[PDB]
Amino acid sequence: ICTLDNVYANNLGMLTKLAHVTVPNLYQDAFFSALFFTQMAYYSEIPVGGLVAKLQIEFLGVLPNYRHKSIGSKLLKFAEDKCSECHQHNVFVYLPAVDDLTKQWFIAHGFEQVGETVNNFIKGVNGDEQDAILLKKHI
Amino acid sequence: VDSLALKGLDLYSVGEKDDAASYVANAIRKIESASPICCHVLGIYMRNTKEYKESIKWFTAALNNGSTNKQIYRDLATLQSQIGDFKSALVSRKKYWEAFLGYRANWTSLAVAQDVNGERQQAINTLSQFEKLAEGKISDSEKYEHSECLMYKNDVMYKAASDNQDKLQNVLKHLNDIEPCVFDKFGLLERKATIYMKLGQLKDASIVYRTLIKRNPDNFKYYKLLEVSLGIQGDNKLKKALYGKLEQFYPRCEPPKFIPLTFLQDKEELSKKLREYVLPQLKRGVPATFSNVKPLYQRRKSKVSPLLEKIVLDYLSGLDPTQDPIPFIWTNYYLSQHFLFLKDFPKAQEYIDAALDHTPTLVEFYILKARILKHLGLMDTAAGILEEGRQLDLQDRFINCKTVKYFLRANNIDKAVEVASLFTKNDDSVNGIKDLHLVEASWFIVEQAEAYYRLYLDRKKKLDDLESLEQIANDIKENQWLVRKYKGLALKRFNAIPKFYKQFEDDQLDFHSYCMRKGTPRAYLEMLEWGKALYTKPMYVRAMKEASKLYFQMHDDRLKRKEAAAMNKRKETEAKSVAAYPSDQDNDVFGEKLIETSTPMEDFATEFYNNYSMQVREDERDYILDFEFNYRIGKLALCFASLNKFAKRFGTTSGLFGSMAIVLLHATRNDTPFDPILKKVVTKSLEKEYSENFPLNEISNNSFDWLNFYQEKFGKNDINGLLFLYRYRDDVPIGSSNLKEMIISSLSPLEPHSQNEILQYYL
Amino acid sequence: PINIRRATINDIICMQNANLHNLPENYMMKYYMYHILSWPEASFVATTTTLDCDGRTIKLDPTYLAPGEKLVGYVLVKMNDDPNEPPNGHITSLSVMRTYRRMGIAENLMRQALFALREVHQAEYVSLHVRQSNRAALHLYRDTLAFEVLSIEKSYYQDGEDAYAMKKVLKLEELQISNFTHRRLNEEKLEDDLESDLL
Ligand SMILES: CC(=O)SCCNC(=O)CCNC(=O)[C@H](O)C(C)(C)COP(=O)(O)OP(=O)(O)OC[C@H]1O[C@@H](n2cnc3c(N)ncnc32)[C@H](O)[C@@H]1OP(=O)(O)O
Ligand SMILES: O=P(O)(O)O[C@H]1[C@H](OP(=O)(O)O)[C@@H](OP(=O)(O)O)[C@H](OP(=O)(O)O)[C@@H](OP(=O)(O)O)[C@@H]1OP(=O)(O)O
């Protein structure tokens, strides 16, 4: 139950679906059409959560009907070990400023704030500006 | 002259088919009476070019001109069996059998030849004679062949005993004598239980039917066969106890859990087992839950549709989409199919949407959503829903094919061809059309041919409705070509199917000798029956029936008369993407010569119909296709025949029958272009058995309104019968404008998919 | 429901279609004939059923073996032909539909094939090859069918993937189908004895 495998650019559409499903305006479509650190969470053959990293947490999502079953945080641990094994101690992520609920509980893991809003980090799908927030951890 | 002959052979063997046949055709003009080693060479050549009837004569002449090679008898036996000349093949078996008595295969061959010639006794004597000669000398390698030849000898005896209990006892004795040497225990047990049933010893048969079930409790056949042996065939109160007692021996197998659902008539109890078969499945989330219970929705919908609806709905009512997500999503998936089968499309979308937005990661949910959209008439949307599903996993070869199907059904042949090319072996080619023809992928070429026929009719109307009032002319020259291009490919892909099934008929050539040396005569006889049904299989008749629309039209349009070449780069480059066969084998890449034919009826006959008609049986014979074919070739005495045979079966109340009679009865007029002798015969035949059905006397009355007769005799609801008349409006004018409108008003009860296609193509 | 029976020549046309929609290795009709006419008691198929409770005719679908009968899976079995050892079988090809997972179709088809391979042809063992990437196949043959992994056969398929050469010795007593009719044990293992009356 709640297993994790890789993407393998055969089922990249899986990942692109989970990123386009949960919080998708920002999620560009040329983004995942380059990649071929990726990892997806499976719930008895059901893809449920995804993770895209850069070396930074570039995306971490889980299906709303399979959250809170410890599943998103399992993807978080995979990112920490990845950092620990690339001889670096900096794991960071950019988040929208209106995203407060995916912060308080999401910052349960040591992830401290760099200091106020950044303004227009990235344009989404429409093309408008989107205030952003930066938090980071250490290995 | 033997030099001009063997050259072709040597020539043929390398690959140059052209001069290979060109050489050989002089070597036969030369003689008119050749050397045996020359007749042998050409017999080997005619066999390779699949000229069996001529190969037999060059092989028969080789011996007639003095030959020593006694293998010509086996070579003649294989070839003669291929053309169905088993009277002459028995002669060849006897001759080769005499020449090599040491090989058991030649005994089995001689026997099989006798068996099919009706000489059932000579076959048994032949096999028995070898049995007695080889007593105590069957080695371990030969034990399989010995087991087959014994079961085969029991097959002949059993078919010769018919229902004679005196003899049926002796075939039972032989079966129990050979049993220690027979390894086909399943077939021996299957045979034994049939004799016990024919012998009336139903108690003994019930013991075998129970042994068979134990050897395979997933086989529905032995379960219900056991019922007849017990006599409880019509006792639901004793069938309930039977399967209940079988539910303990085999509690994982479905026959004990499913067969009760076909006879229980008490709602309370029937609903209990219904709950026991589909609820554990929805618990495990097995996607085929509805597909396993759908037969009940077709044979006894009225008493199983609503009781399953309550069971599943109540089940889902107490489901948590957090907590129990696997059973939650797969119960919505069931309920979506439950309502889709009931044509309750609003609820059908209602239950698939939840499962999808809850779990948009299982491709099954996409196929079902795309399946409902195709029922609604949104082919291009349904195709889009499926391309989303295949984006989830590009390795799934199953979703690709389902996706390729939906793109072909939406006439998107370009997306379809290239989605399919992701799994084909292209190599030194562009797409996968030539590879799909190599692997005999009939699922693709039929769907693509039907798509081309749809695209041809769509661009045809775009030609007529734009020709009705500069570039608005060279643009006509582009569409004038697209209509000829899609019509040819539609017909060139349809003609690719008989090429496959004649290969299936040539593929049994090697088995006339191989099955004998392998010692599988019983499985070989099943191959001869299989070869005599190849042109009746669903894929062959689907291509034939669909291609008849083109051939029949080409004859019907034949009725009333139907800075120059600097664009060939458009045609020459596009011919590289539609090529089906190697360039060294096909020059009519666009079927250009198929659509410009001057004998459309004889092309359809020698490419599809003749081989089908000769093999099809009355049970499954298409009589409407028979009528429509003989009508366009003159045989009116075969049109009433099909209509009479169609009548034997479907009641004189069918609206299709009435339309066929009206069209035929109208051909019995003096102004019609038919043979007056057949006209007189068909008139007599129409009076003899259908005088109390139609006002035959009023075919001469030019003021009789037959549409009004149809209306009052068959209603305005029989869509298919109205469409048949509308097909023959040029030969039988009865108010085409009034007929068209009445067809349109009868489309209200059909689903939007069937209405759209009737309006867009059938009218 | 799903019916499971022996394969006949009248099944191979639909078998080819099933293989063309599922598996990457495709064969000509002549190859299926060479299987079903050389070893006509080894191959098994899994189909749907429509038992009488009206009637119907056959649908012009590439999957219809008979009216109301749809092919969902098959197993193409054969003895070793290649030229010097004891008798041994070989699973040439196995395919089961995606929507008919989680019903034991794959397992049921293989058990009949393994039993028929030992009883009819007296095979000492049966060999096959599995793609390493396919984890669902490794769990089927090895973990539930008691197969054993032998070699690795790096780059065995034409695409470049590494196979899983597996083999299983065949003993009629262990392959008996009546051995795997129950799951949760302990409990009473009630089975038929072919003697007492069922009524
Ligand atoms: C630009 C970018 O890339 S931003 C990344 C995408 N943007 C988003 O807003 C993500 C969308 N939000 C989500 O997908 C979910 O809300 C998540 C990821 C926060 C939840 O992930 P889950 O798999 O459910 O975590 P898990 O399996 O451990 O179970 C939830 C537990 O993890 C905790 N948790 C909350 N947020 C997080 C987080 N970011 N990471 C790890 N754990 C978290 C919760 O406190 C919860 O505790 P509980 O079980 O007592 O209720
Ligand atoms: O046999 P079923 O389980 O009842 O479903 C099939 C369906 O096959 P699937 O199981 O893969 O869905 C076919 O394909 P889809 O359209 O569903 O993708 C479709 O064949 P068609 O191409 O003609 O649709 C057909 O008919 P329909 O969808 O109209 O119900 C339908 O049922 P049949 O077995 O009765 O032909």
Ligand SMILES: [Cl-]
């Ligand atoms: Cl924002």
Ligand SMILES: [Cl-]
């Ligand atoms: Cl009786």
Ligand SMILES: [Cl-]
């Ligand atoms: Cl969607």
Ligand SMILES: [Cl-]
């Ligand atoms: Cl035309």
Ligand SMILES: [Cl-]
């Ligand atoms: Cl061969």
Ligand SMILES: [Cl-]
């Ligand atoms: Cl027709």
Ligand SMILES: [Cl-]
């Ligand atoms: Cl026409």
Ligand SMILES: [Cl-]
């Ligand atoms: Cl003819």
Ligand SMILES: [Cl-]
């Ligand atoms: Cl008949």
Ligand SMILES: [Cl-]
């Ligand atoms: Cl005519």
Ligand SMILES: [Cl-]
């Ligand atoms: Cl071969």
Ligand SMILES: [Cl-]
């Ligand atoms: Cl009824």
Ligand SMILES: [Cl-]
């Ligand atoms: Cl790999």
Ligand SMILES: [Cl-]
């Ligand atoms: Cl597999």
Ligand SMILES: [Cl-]
């Ligand atoms: Cl398994």
Ligand SMILES: [Cl-]
């Ligand atoms: Cl009894």
